[PDB]
Write a protein that binds this ligand. Structure first.
Ligand SMILES: [Mg+2]
Ligand SMILES: [Mg+2]
Ligand SMILES: [Mg+2]
Ligand SMILES: [Mg+2]
Ligand SMILES: [Mg+2]
Ligand SMILES: [Mg+2]
Ligand SMILES: [Mg+2]
Ligand SMILES: [Mg+2]
Ligand SMILES: [Mg+2]
Ligand SMILES: [Mg+2]
Ligand SMILES: [Mg+2]
Ligand SMILES: [Mg+2]
Ligand SMILES: [Mg+2]
Ligand SMILES: [Mg+2]
Ligand SMILES: [Mg+2]
Ligand SMILES: [Mg+2]
Ligand SMILES: [Mg+2]
Ligand SMILES: [Mg+2]
Ligand SMILES: [Mg+2]
Ligand SMILES: [Mg+2]
Ligand SMILES: [Mg+2]
Ligand SMILES: [Mg+2]
Ligand SMILES: [Mg+2]
Ligand SMILES: [Mg+2]
Ligand SMILES: [Mg+2]
Ligand SMILES: [Mg+2]
Ligand SMILES: [Mg+2]
Ligand SMILES: [Mg+2]
Ligand SMILES: [Mg+2]
Ligand SMILES: [Mg+2]
Ligand SMILES: [Mg+2]
Ligand SMILES: [Mg+2]
Ligand SMILES: [Mg+2]
Ligand SMILES: [Mg+2]
Ligand SMILES: [Mg+2]
Ligand SMILES: [Mg+2]
Ligand SMILES: [Mg+2]
Ligand SMILES: [Mg+2]
Ligand SMILES: [Mg+2]
Ligand SMILES: [Mg+2]
Ligand SMILES: [Mg+2]
Ligand SMILES: [Mg+2]
Ligand SMILES: [Mg+2]
Ligand SMILES: [Mg+2]
Ligand SMILES: [Mg+2]
Ligand SMILES: [Mg+2]
Ligand SMILES: [Mg+2]
Ligand SMILES: [Mg+2]
Ligand SMILES: [Zn+2]
Lengths: 69, 120, 91, 50, 114
RNA sequence: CCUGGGCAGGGCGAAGCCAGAGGAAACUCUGGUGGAGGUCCGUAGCGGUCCUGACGUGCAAAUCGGUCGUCCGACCUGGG
RNA sequence: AGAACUUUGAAGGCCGAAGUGGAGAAGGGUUCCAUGUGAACAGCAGUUGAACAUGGGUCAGUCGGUCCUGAGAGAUGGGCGAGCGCCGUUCCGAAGGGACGGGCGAUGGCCUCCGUUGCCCUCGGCCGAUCGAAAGGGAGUCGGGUUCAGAUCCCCGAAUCCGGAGUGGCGGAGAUGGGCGCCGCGAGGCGUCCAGUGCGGUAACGCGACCGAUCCCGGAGAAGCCGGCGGGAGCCCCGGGGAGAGUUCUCUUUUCUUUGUGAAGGGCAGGGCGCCCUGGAAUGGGUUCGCCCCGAGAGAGGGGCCCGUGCCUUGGAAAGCGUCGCGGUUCCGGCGGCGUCCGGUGAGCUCUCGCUGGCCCUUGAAAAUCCGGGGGAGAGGGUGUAAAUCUCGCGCCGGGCCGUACCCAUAUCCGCAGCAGGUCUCCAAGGUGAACAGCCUCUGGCAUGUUGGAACAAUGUAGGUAAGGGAAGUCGGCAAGCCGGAUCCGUAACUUCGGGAUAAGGAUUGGCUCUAAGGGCUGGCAGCCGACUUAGAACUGGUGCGGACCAGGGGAAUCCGA
């Protein structure tokens, strides 16, 4: 898998087609966002819950989102 | 096992009769020489790189440690102290003799200047 | 400390195969194990390769020498005769 | 199986652009990099076949 | 204390069965298989030995994966000479060609004087 | 012949190297380092000296128990 | 129905990591698993089995065969032979059916634009068809879970390789600059010309890509054995915490198990360099365990590259494990809480990586595949418009065939058999100990090896003693027994001067207290932290001390063979 550092590159990946799975995993100190586009797994890890909430708001609506527990 | 190992660490149960292998089998002569001479050769590096020994006595004591002369760190450090004191005494006597010769040559050149001023 | 007084390098063979044969193998084992002065790089790094082949350490210039020494006396005589017949009356 | 050394002398083909490699018996005193000449009018030195 | 087992049916400790041992996330010492080591390319026929610097030392079937940056050096004679050969062959070619020009013009002076 | 695999620990301490002492020189002496070998004790492995032991219609149409020889090699061994 | 033998509980033992354990190659072919029977078989028996009957079980791009050659085997040309046939593998052969490109012609698709077919020219040693390894070479899958039987194959999740692209799938390179004149306050616009098949570092070399055809060169594939030494992992050891369990007659902050991060990408340790720049040594200097290195450039300073199997990070805690509790007859890889932590050390063992050396009339394999370089034939749009190409990031499609169970053995192989025989390998714990020796324990297996019970006669087979003599027995010291380890003394005849030699002959060895010595890390001589060795002294035990185990009798000679 790959680790996207910036937020704009991850949201460009989310805008990019042929991506069929987004997994949001809350953790004890941060939160991880998972895109399974095709044969790779792209992860945006971020430690700000407000930025996670606004990224969930700005997430494109034509795509499935699964929250892990 | 822990009680027996603590007794071995204190130095018990390790006499003459409870040795069933040779001394070179128990503690190897090559390993003893490696530990001994690596310590006696990096103490000279810690002296040379910091302050103590110069460039020229370092190689002499290096070869003298490679030869079986210096048994351990204490007598190595004492022999370095003896050579440092002897070198300090020799350079003190050399500085005194050089100061005497330098004042003599300076006085001779100034007296040559005095005779040249008296001639012209 | 000099340990062996007569056998020299042949003490690895110990007690076997005769005093005269060990004496005759002594000089040529010294000859095959001695480092020779390289005529090209000027160093003493002529290490023995396989038989007939000598190999200097620096500058990697492999030379075809004798089987046990660097120059056979017969080979030096041949080289002197070849240069003499070379400069003798222009072939 | 041979106590004599083998020498690997590379030549140049005057007819086609290709460096041909042959296997000579190493004469005494040759060294790697020596220009081993070969032919009829080659000058008499150690290594030169004539 | 956990004795471990082969995973293929290669029971003999050959060169292709050159292995190592790692630890699974399920807390079990597993016996993993290691690709054999790849040596870097060396120079061309005569210089002091030593592998050429700046080449990803892999297997030649991994050289299909490797791109045209981690296989050569941007110098002329890049992935073939160790650049000591380059700085010697440039000077050697230059000096021998200049000496051939000197011999040719000396023979031309011999033609003019004879 | 080709292609692979394997051999616990110790003992003896060759060449080379270092330091010190002697000598005019040749060189010699002492203390270390070094790890050589179709080298020694000895295990696995490989063979089988002796008890002419045990069996001897036996476990076996040649095996077993001690005692053994060798174990870096002229070593043992699989497959083609 | 029936128990010395089947199963379970418990106790006592053996195998004791060079196994009576966990898995394979050859071989066996259903023996693997479940259910039922016990007349056959298992040398007694069975309610049992590898027996019998019924029914199941082996899932692969990334494990191997398949590809390649090795020693060798082999057909054509050719020769021989009455003849089936034999010799030979480059020899006595017209032994390539391929191709960069150009021209000419024709067909076909959306005949613009491309894709095909034929002819001609040009170019092109094969070291000669072909076979030959389930251990050689050979790209790429790993983590968890699942069954009565499968496991890198099946499910989930995470990756990689190899082929494919014609109307050439999308981005990014190639790609976008300079000069002149005009308009305009400038920003900018217009017209002409020219460049542009990438850049940076002095370097060793680096990046997101970097036009390359016949041809040539090179590297990898592609290397023996034995020493040393250093780094890394795993296992072991110690100190502390956390969870559960054991003992508590008395003591013991005690004892035992566990305390995790795969492949893949990035970053950073660590190791290495025969890689570069500055610079020039002698009063020679730098380093190794040993060496070795230096004017063909040492020390010193600064760089560059390679392996990075180690740590962190996405994977990755949501799974896994420990422990406690709660729901569903059951079906749910259920549901919830807590943890899954800080360090130190090593003549430690195994594996692996790297440096260096020794040995040689021993030089320790080929081929398939793949890459780089030299050449510049050729191709490309010619401009405010964009190509010829891409070994860059993505996206799409496919990976066919065969094997996959089990034993791998004192019971699934061979030996006529459930035969003390034989058969090739990987993994290896704790203590004593030099040791993978011998002995005892742990994980993991087992019922003592095709029978049980009672008594302990002769003879026997293995084992141990025996007062006094010590080889008087016997063909012969046959067998058995003595010395046996380690430390410190001392070692002869002879000799090829290497040996003989552990020659021979003596002393000590236990337990408990001490003493001394052998190191590292921090500072402008002081303080903290741990390793196991040696030597000496005192005290004490019934002269006992290698306390079991481990384990050389020795000397003088002769013959023969080094
Ligand atoms: Mg030694
Ligand atoms: Mg293979
Ligand atoms: Mg021997
Ligand atoms: Mg002897
Ligand atoms: Mg034996
Ligand atoms: Mg036999
Ligand atoms: Mg026997
Ligand atoms: Mg008998
Ligand atoms: Mg009988
Ligand atoms: Mg024996
Ligand atoms: Mg022996
Ligand atoms: Mg027991
Ligand atoms: Mg076994
Ligand atoms: Mg039944
Ligand atoms: Mg029966
Ligand atoms: Mg069965
Ligand atoms: Mg049946
Ligand atoms: Mg799959
Ligand atoms: Mg395969
Ligand atoms: Mg034939
Ligand atoms: Mg014919
Ligand atoms: Mg084949
Ligand atoms: Mg199975
Ligand atoms: Mg699994
Ligand atoms: Mg591809
Ligand atoms: Mg090591
Ligand atoms: Mg380590
Ligand atoms: Mg990794
Ligand atoms: Mg299987
Ligand atoms: Mg049997
Ligand atoms: Mg039979
Ligand atoms: Mg057997
Ligand atoms: Mg142990
Ligand atoms: Mg111990
Ligand atoms: Mg082992
Ligand atoms: Mg049996
Ligand atoms: Mg029996
Ligand atoms: Mg019974
Ligand atoms: Mg008696
Ligand atoms: Mg008596
Ligand atoms: Mg007597
Ligand atoms: Mg008598
Ligand atoms: Mg008699
Ligand atoms: Mg006897
Ligand atoms: Mg007795
Ligand atoms: Mg004797
Ligand atoms: Mg003996
Ligand atoms: Mg004999
Ligand atoms: Zn040289």
């Amino acid at each position: 898998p790959r680790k996207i550092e910036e937020i704009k590159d991850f949201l460009l990946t989310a805008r990019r087609k042929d991506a069929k799975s987004v997994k949001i995993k809350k953790n004890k100190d941060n939160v991880k966002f998972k895109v399974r586009c095709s044969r790779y797994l792209y992860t945006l890890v971020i430690t700000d819950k407000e930025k996670a909430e606004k990224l969930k708001q700005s997430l494109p609506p034509g795509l499935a989102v699964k929250e892990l527990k | 096992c822990r009680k027996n190992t603590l007794a071995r660490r204190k130095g018990r149960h390790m006499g003459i009769g409870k040795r069933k292998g040779t001394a070179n089998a128990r503690m190897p002569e090559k390993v003893t020489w490696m530990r001994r001479m690596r310590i006696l050769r990096r103490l000279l590096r810690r002296y040379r790189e910091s302050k103590k020994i110069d460039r020229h006595m370092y190689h002499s004591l290096y070869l003298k440690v490679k030869g079986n002369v210096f048994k351990n760190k204490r007598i190595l450090m004492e022999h370095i102290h003896k050579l440092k004191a002897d070198k300090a005494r020799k350079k003190l006597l050399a500085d005194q003799a050089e100061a005497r010769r330098s004042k003599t040559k300076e006085a001779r050149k100034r007296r040559e200047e005095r005779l040249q001023a008296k001639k012209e | 400390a000099k340990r062996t007084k007569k056998v020299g390098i042949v003490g690895k063979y110990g007690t076997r195969y005769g005093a005269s044969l060990r004496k005759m193998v002594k000089k040529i084992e010294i000859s095959q194990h001695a480092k020779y002065t390289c005529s090209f790089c000027g160093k003493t790094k002529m290490k023995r390769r396989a038989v007939g082949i000598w190999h200097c350490g620096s500058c990697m210039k492999t030379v075809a020498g004798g089987a046990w020494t660097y120059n056979t006396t017969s080979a030096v005589t041949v080289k002197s005769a070849i240069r003499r017949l070379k400069e003798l009356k222009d072939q | 199986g041979r106590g004599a050394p083998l020498a690997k002398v590379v030549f140049r083909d005057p007819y086609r652009f290709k460096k041909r490699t042959e296997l000579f018996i190493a004469a005494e005193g040759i060294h790697t990099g020596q220009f081993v000449y070969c032919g009829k009018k080659a000058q008499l030195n150690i290594g030169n076949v004539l | 204390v956990q004795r471990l087992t082969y995973r293929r049916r290669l029971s003999y400790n050959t060169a292709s069965n050159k292995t190592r041992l790692s630890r699974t996330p399920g807390n079990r010492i597993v016996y993993l298989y290691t690709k054999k080591v790849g040596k870097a390319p060396k120079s061309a026929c005569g210089v002091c030995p030593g592998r050429l610097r700046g080449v990803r030392a892999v297997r030649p079937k991994v050289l299909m994966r490797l791109s045209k940056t981690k296989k050569h050096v941007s110098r002329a004679y890049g992935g073939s000479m160790c650049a000591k050969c380059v700085r010697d062959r440039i000077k050697r070619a230059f000096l021998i060609e200049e000496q051939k020009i000197v011999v040719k013009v000396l023979k031309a002076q011999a033609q003019s004087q004879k």
